[PDB]
From a paper:
Here, we present a structure of the MASS complex solved by single particle cryogenic electron microscopy (cryo-EM). We were able to build a molecular model for a MASSα2βγ2δ complex using the high-resolution EM map. One MASSα protomer is more complete than the other (MASSα: residues 15 to 839, MASSα′: residues 36 to 677, missing density for loops 375 to 380 and 588 to 593). Both MASSα and MASSα' bind one MASSγ protomer in a similar manner as BSSα binds BSSγ. One protomer of MASSβ and one of MASSδ are also bound to MASSα; however, there is no density for either of these subunits on MASSα′. Comparison of the α-subunits reveals that the GRD is completely disordered when the β- and δ-subunits are absent, consistent with increased GRD mobility in the absence of these subunits. However, instead of finding density for the predicted [4Fe–4S] cluster, the density was consistent with the presence of a single Fe ion. Furthermore, when we compare the overall fold of MASSδ to that of other known proteins, we observe that MASSδ has a rubredoxin-like fold, a fold associated with the binding of a single Fe ion [Fig. 4B (33)]. Like BSS, one carboxylate group of fumarate is held in place by an oxyanion hole created by the Cys loop whereas the other carboxylate group forms an electrostatic interaction with an active site Arg residue (Arg508 in BSS, Arg492 in MASS). In BSS, BSSβ is the only barrier to toluene entering the active site; however, in MASS, Trp185 blocks the substrate channel as well. Specifically, we propose that MASSβ gates substrate entry, whereas MASSδ regulates GRD conformational changes.
Fumarate addition is accomplished by X-succinate synthases (XSSs), which are members of the glycyl radical enzyme (GRE) superfamily. The denitrifying betaproteobacterium Azoarcus sp. strain HxN1 has been shown to degrade saturated alkanes, including n-hexane, n-heptane, and n-octane. A homolog of the catalytic BSS subunit has previously been identified in strain HxN1 and is thought to catalyze the addition of fumarate to these alkanes at the C2 position, thus producing (1-methylalkyl)succinates. As such, this homolog is referred to as (1-methylalkyl)succinate synthase (MASS).
Numbering used by the authors:
A (entry chain F): 3 to 53
B (entry chain B): 2 to 119
C (entry chain A): 15 to 839
D (entry chain D): 1 to 69
E (entry chain E): 36 to 374, 381 to 587, 594 to 677
F (entry chain C): 2 to 54
The structure:
């Protein structure tokens, strides 16, 4: 799921909830982005998942 | 904050949606046939209160939350399933007669409960 | 067997009236399906109407974007177009709320709780029970959540919503969906204005509004657009009403084609012509006037529940009755009696589904329907005429329980009218209920500041409360839905504001009981509880009335009131209306009787400590029966001309009146209290626990608002009159219900009227506003209890309304039988 | 107490209390928990006497001029 | 500086060239999707409370980003390249979003499927749809036909004024506003459980409004906390010490503001950018009223000149990056509206009225010079005693050709505001540029909460209606009032009377539509966040937006035609009155010689000819009085 | 067939298509006539009261 992913980060040691961090490089600028994630959620059709 | 407490109680009272779809039948062990059930008098919609359980109890989930220490009773409906409630007890006297005025303690006037002989 | 002479000699009145009435009246009386509730259940043959809810839901879904009142207008227009309409075999007056005579109407958007009760109600669904319940569930699924009462509950403070709808302290619904409204008879019932004239006025207003909104842009035209929609809605519904009448006319003509009897064909043609005339054009004869009024009421009841029938038939049908029967003799007196009796029967036929508190609180009746008789004109002269005599005779002939009469008695009432009213009382109908007209005029003027001329036109709103029918005097909302269970105040003083019924802390923690030092502390605690209850109920009803135009909307009522038509506002809007709001107090006597018992046995006798009293009340007099008997017998009771209790009663009324003057309605008027019980003394019989006056939970509360308890009074009727007379009816309260019972043997014969007239003079000289009488033997009621096979026309006055004995619940029957049989003399 | 119809022998509280028309007298309607029959009870001395039928009038009236007890 | 160069090079311009976006710009779909889901969740809530809950849900679940060298955070959109969409602004806007090419992602089929589903849900439930339904059906069909003009009569588009004195003095932040709202809510709750009276009846919906006002600020604070978490994560990833310090400072800034009043210059700038961003998550907000040099003044002066907390060049760097963050914002606009510009005000006078100009004016000028953004154009407010160095810097900046500052004559503008508004003298000093020609003070009572979108009037269709008796060939409909047949006239004065009776109806149509929209928009389109940051709305617990002037389009071609018709047809008699009608019905087809004559000797505007200026003055004067009447 | 051939159908006008289905119902308490709008083009389908001619 999310827990094993490289970019998933827990908000706090005791919080199951994380924020997903994706490093994205656009034509003109590279930037970070975050989106909430519940950490129990299936990776399912996630193309950005990393080991 | 009393507002949050009364909002929680009101939201528990407005148990509408899928639960309204559930009214076709009553479970084998229902709150409506429990001894500790006090039926509502404002309407025959099936709402009521629990004399034993209090405040933010919950008996729907398998891991029931039982809080017997509180100020306000637990809002239960006549068709709520009681197979997971520790304090459930089949009441010995069920007055299904609906031709008499309301008796919250011992009178059940709902159509579904009309066939529930003791 | 059962010959007229024998029936008169043996005092039977139901079978005598059955014998007396004509064939048409007998058929129409036996063709009515009773719409009352036996306990919480309707009659066995009654069925729930699915045609009106299905049609209303289908039309309502078609216009999601329309405003509430315009959308309701369109929906009810579609219903009137497509609903099934029927004419009985021997009916001269047409009109019904439903699709079949044996069927009650369902208020779809009244409340989600009401819809759930509809689903849960046994025996009111059609033969395909699975299919009928499936349709009901399909309706409920759509209508669950977006209901006006749900909006009110979500808007008010959550504590108020939870406690109000808990069913322990309130007996009302804060919306126009359930309740009633006042009819502006001065607008649509003066012989110059009918639906076509109102439509013409609305058209003129729409034309000027559109001209304003099509020309120069100024802020004054900004509020016009909503007004336009309102006006359109009103006009639309009015047009639908005309089309509705047209449908009946067409059907009548078709029936006239089929009929092979010349007289019935002629009557059907007359009905067709009547429905073609009214409500489009002002009535020209008696039948057209009756049809016009019945059409107005039926359309109003299609609009909403309308649990009361406010009308003054002898004052507005009086001119046309005088023109027809007396001035030019178009129709004989017998035909006039036939028309009036069948009009009353048509009134009784109305039935609708009401919440459980309304159903149990109104045993045997869909609602309380009181028609005002007698009175005075705006000038002040006697307003009684031959139409009043016709109405009294028709009521005696038909013996219909639900439509009752309130007679506005004034000193110059002609003796023949008093004799007819006494004859109606003596037959056991329970009505007319004599009302002291001058003190009621003074009461209206003092409380709401109505002008004298407007106040003289008052009619009963539901049971007791006067309400003028003028342009500003009339009230369009049931502000009395702030009903209170008065016993709750004293029960919360003795239980620290905790209620066992709802398993909730209801009242404020005025202080722990069992330690009250002196009577002053207890009275202060009771004052705190009473003020809390009044504030809660009045705030809830005030917000309901304020938000009703947006939540519910009423096109027809706004269409038939001068205020709304003139200003383009909704009817229930307080824009130009005098408040005329009051609080009804159920079981008021219990508070003062408990006060008396405590003040006597605890503080002034030291017979019992407060600890023993509280322990006995918690144990509900179990193992303390001797203590209960001591509290009943030794404790002085109201209605015995004893100053010990009467002073406490006056003090309670004084503090209540002071608080009433403090609080204000949506219009800024006062909130006087009105002691009365109806059948609420039986609905709440299990909601109020043991009290120091000797009651036990499950016992019935006291019958009337200010009447003595069952058997408690011992001095006699004169002492009751004197005790009630100590109340200043003009100042202390809005009105006070005084139920009483008279022995049929005493009232029989020549001298019965003289005794009744002496009692009436005594009642009037003491300034008592209201009196009621119940004249029925105990043996007849016991026989009806044993077997209801023949006693289908036995009527008993319960509290402010009459009902058939074999229809009310067994507990109510046993309690009504127990009332004291006072002896005049 | 001792129910007349059946020898249930319960406590006074166990019988279900219906109502008492005469608030000044000590006699009311209660339902036996075993046989569910409605019977008349004398709260003062706490025993059941007879069952209650529809036509019966055990209470009477403590006032009035017509049917006194 | 290098960071300024990188940030300038890393911006995706949101301006429209030739009336169209650049290729890279894309429409954001995450924001409309989240907003629609949240809207679906709560059907029973009032408009403002429902919008507050929807915006809170969006801010919780929106995708946020921090650029590689960014020192300020906050963006209206899910990515730097995307554009904002006002999903429930107007159904016409939604349909144009569907139609518009080039702003849809690579799965163009799937993206258009999602856009079509969103439009299907929002079709018939938009605020403009409600305004059109409330107006009379004929008026709605005329207005939304597009022949008379294009306008959006709702608060979803328009210009919003910000009560800067309320939340930008330094005394108050979002937490202090939340505390005051809590005080108001507690007082209202106390009232609603007290004595019944008609006075407390309005307080219920007022309580709901206050609840929405509080919810939006809580959501905003959580949004800044999310940005702080992202900053801390990026600090954990990155290794360079300077970028580590910058990211930690960004995290501290996002934690301090908007919850608490700013302590340094960076916190002040970030607080203001957060306020602007959260404002533009609510509606279109076609303008940028803010003035930086005044409300950031004390903090910048304290940090740079008072105590040398930060180096001087870093101030210019931060201001340049602030303007960069200003330029990145953009929302979709209708093609007619896409054809505004974010304008700030510098210099000016204090509340007392003495030399509000400080060192940050110079900082702003230098940052604009090196950054060279086009949209953030700030005009200067010139008092008679401006310091010479400030004007020298302004002239040096104007030399570079940036197009700003556009010096505003401050005293005459002050007197204009004094004369037609009647604001107090001290209030009139503290004014900002709200609309292209409108000033608006920033005090409590002086501030205007919201101004309408100024719908567009086609000043050419009225003449065509006059000469066609109110009938347009473009759409087979009868729109203009039928005054008379153009064939029978008497004089150019009678023709002027017909034109005037057409034009009065045309202008009244737009004025009535905009006025009804302005009246009804509290119920149709609530504004929770705008109400939160205005002192009046917080104090009285009312919706913040509770005169309308319409722009004229193509008014010059009509006066050209009027001059040609007045002089050629009657004064010179070269052509008869019927021939022009017959040529116009054929659209000058087969009448090439007559068309060339009618445009040749028919004088064009700009000839400096008293006869042409005569009709120009007449046509403008007659409309001016009608505008005055309205 | 359709409502046209039913004995219970009565057109409101000699030219108008719309009409009223008029039926006589008998209850245990009373007998009456009920009228209901009908379009005269709707098929009988599952109509238990339809009676041709
Ligand atoms: O609405 C009520 O409860 C009472 C009404 C009346 O007495 O008129
Ligand atoms: S990339 Fe996908 S799997 Fe990895 S944290 Fe983000 S959402 Fe979860
Ligand atoms: S089943 Fe449990 S929750 Fe329900 S009434 Fe009985 S004790 Fe209360
Ligand atoms: S009975 Fe059936 S077929 Fe005949 S007219 Fe009525 S609806 Fe039509
Ligand atoms: Fe027994």
């Amino acid at each position: 799921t999310c827990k094993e992913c490289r970019n998933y980060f827990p908000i706090n040691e005791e919080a199951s909830r994380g924020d997903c961090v994706r490093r994205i490089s656009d034509e003109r600028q590279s930037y970070y982005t975050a989106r909430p994630t519940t950490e129990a959620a299936k990776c399912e059709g996630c193309s950005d998942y990393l080991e | 904050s009393r507002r949050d407490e009364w909002k929680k109680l009101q939201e528990e009272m407005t148990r509408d949606g899928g639960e309204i779809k559930s009214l076709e039948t009553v479970p084998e062990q229902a709150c409506g046939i429990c001894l500790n059930f006090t039926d509502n008098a404002y309407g025959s919609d099936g709402r009521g209160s629990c004399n034993v359980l209090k405040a933010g109890s919950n008996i729907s989930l398998p891991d029931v939350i039982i809080t017997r220490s509180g100020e306000n009773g637990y809002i239960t409906f006549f068709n709520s399933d009681a197979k997971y409630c520790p304090n459930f007890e089949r009441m010995k006297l069920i007055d299904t007669d609906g031709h008499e005025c309301a008796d919250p303690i011992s009178r059940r006037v709902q159509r579904q409960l009309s066939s529930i002989k003791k | 067997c059962e010959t007229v002479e024998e029936l008169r000699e043996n005092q039977q009145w139901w079978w005598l009236a059955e014998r007396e009435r004509s064939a048409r009246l007998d058929y129409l009386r036996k063709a009515t399906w009773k719409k009352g509730a036996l306990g919480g259940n309707y009659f066995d043959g009654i069925r729930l109407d699915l045609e009106y809810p299905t049609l209303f839901t289908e039309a309502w879904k078609k216009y999601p974007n329309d405003p509430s009142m315009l959308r309701r207008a369109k929906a009810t227009a579609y219903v009137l177009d497509n609903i099934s309409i029927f004419i009985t075999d021997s009916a001269q007056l047409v009109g019904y709320v439903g699709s079949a005579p044996h069927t009650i109407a369902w208020r779809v958007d009244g409340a989600s709780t009401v819809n759930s009760e509809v689903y849960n109600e046994p025996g009111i669904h059609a033969e395909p029970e699975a299919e009928s319940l499936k349709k009901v569930a399909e309706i409920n699924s759509y209508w669950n959540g977006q209901t006006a009462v749900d909006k009110v509950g979500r808007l008010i403070d959550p504590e108020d919503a939870v406690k109000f709808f808990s069913g322990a302290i309130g007996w009302g619904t804060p919306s126009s969906a359930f309740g009633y409204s006042g009819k502006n008879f001065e607008y649509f019932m003066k012989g110059d204005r009918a639906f076509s004239q109102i439509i013409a006025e609305i058209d003129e207003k729409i034309d000027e509004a559109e001209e304003a909104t099509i020309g120069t842009p100024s802020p004054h035209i900004l509020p016009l657009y909503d007004k336009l929609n309102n006006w359109h809605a009103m006009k639309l519904v009015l047009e639908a009403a005309i089309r509705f009448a047209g449908r009946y006319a067409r059907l009548a003509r078709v029936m006239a084609a089929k009929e092979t009897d010349e007289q019935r064909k002629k009557e059907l043609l007359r009905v067709a012509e009547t429905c073609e005339r009214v409500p489009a054009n002002p009535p020209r004869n008696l039948q057209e006037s009756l049809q016009y009024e019945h059409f107005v009421q039926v359309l109003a009841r299609y609009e909403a529940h309308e649990g009361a029938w406010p009308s003054r038939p002898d004052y507005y049908h009086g001119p046309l009755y005088a023109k027809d029967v007396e001035v030019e003799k178009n129709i004989t007196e017998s035909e006039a009696i036939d028309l009036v009796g069948e009009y009353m029967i048509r009134c009784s036929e109305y039935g609708s589904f009401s919440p459980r508190y309304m159903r149990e609180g109104l045993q045997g009746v869909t609602g309380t329907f009181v028609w005002t008789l007698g009175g005075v004109n705006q000038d002040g002269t006697d307003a009684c005429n031959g139409m009043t005599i016709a109405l009294l005779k028709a009521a005696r002939l038909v013996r219909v329980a639900n439509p009752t009469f309130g007679f506005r008695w004034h000193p110059k009432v002609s003796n023949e009218v008093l004799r007819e009213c006494f004859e109606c009382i003596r037959q056991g109908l329970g009505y007319p209920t004599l009302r002291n007209d001058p003190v009621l005029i003074q009461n209206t003027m003092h409380w709401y500041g109505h002008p004298l001329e407007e106040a003289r036109t008052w009619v009963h709103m539901a049971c007791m409360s006067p309400n003028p029918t003028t342009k500003h005097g009339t009230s369009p909302f049931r502000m009395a839905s702030a009903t209170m269970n008065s016993a709750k105040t004293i029960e919360y003083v003795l239980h620290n504001g905790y209620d066992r019924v709802v398993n909730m802390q209801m009242g404020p923690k005025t202080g722990d009981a069992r330690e009250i030092k002196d009577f002053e502390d207890l009275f202060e605690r009771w004052t705190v509880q009473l003020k809390w209850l009044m504030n809660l109920l009045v705030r809830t009803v005030n917000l309901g009335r304020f938000k009703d135009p947006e939540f519910f909307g009423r096109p027809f009522l706004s269409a038939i009131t001068e205020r709304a038509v003139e200003h383009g506002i909704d009817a229930v809007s307080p824009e130009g209306e005098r408040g005329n709001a009051w609080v009804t107090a159920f079981t008021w006597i219990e508070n003062v009787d408990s006060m008396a018992a405590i003040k006597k046995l605890v503080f002034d006798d030291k017979k019992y400590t407060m600890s023993q009293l509280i322990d006995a009340l918690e144990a509900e007099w179990d193992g303390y029966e001797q203590m209960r008997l001591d509290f009943v017998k030794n404790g002085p009771k109201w209605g015995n001309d004893d100053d010990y209790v009467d002073d406490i009663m006056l003090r309670c009324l004084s503090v209540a009146a002071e608080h009433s003057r403090n609080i204000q309605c949506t219009s800024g008027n006062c909130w006087p209290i009105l002691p009365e019980n109806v059948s609420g003394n039986i609905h709440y019989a299990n909601i109020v626990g043991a009290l120091p006056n000797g009651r036990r939970r499950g016992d019935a509360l006291y019958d009337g608002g200010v009447s003595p308890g069952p058997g408690l009074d011992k001095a006699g009727p004169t002492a009751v009159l004197k005790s009630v007379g100590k109340i200043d009816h003009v100042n202390q309260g809005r009105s006070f219900l005084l139920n009483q019972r008279l022995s049929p043997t005493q009232l029989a014969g020549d001298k019965g009227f003289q005794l009744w007239n002496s009692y009436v003079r005594t009642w009037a000289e003491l300034g008592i506003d209201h009196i009621q009488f119940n004249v029925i033997s105990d043996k007849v009621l016991r026989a009806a209890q044993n077997d209801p096979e023949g006693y289908q026309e036995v009527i008993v006055r319960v509290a402010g309304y009459s009902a058939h004995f074999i229809d009310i619940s067994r507990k109510t029957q046993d309690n009504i039988i127990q009332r004291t049989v006072q002896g005049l003399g | 107490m001792k129910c007349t119809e059946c020898g249930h022998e319960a406590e006074v509280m166990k019988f279900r209390y219906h109502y008492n028309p005469r608030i000044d007298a000590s006699l009311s309607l209660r339902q036996c928990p075993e046989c569910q029959a409605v019977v008349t009870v004398d709260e003062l001395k706490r025993e059941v006497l007879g069952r209650m039928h529809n036509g019966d009038d055990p209470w009477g009236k403590s006032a009035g001029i017509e049917n006194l007890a």
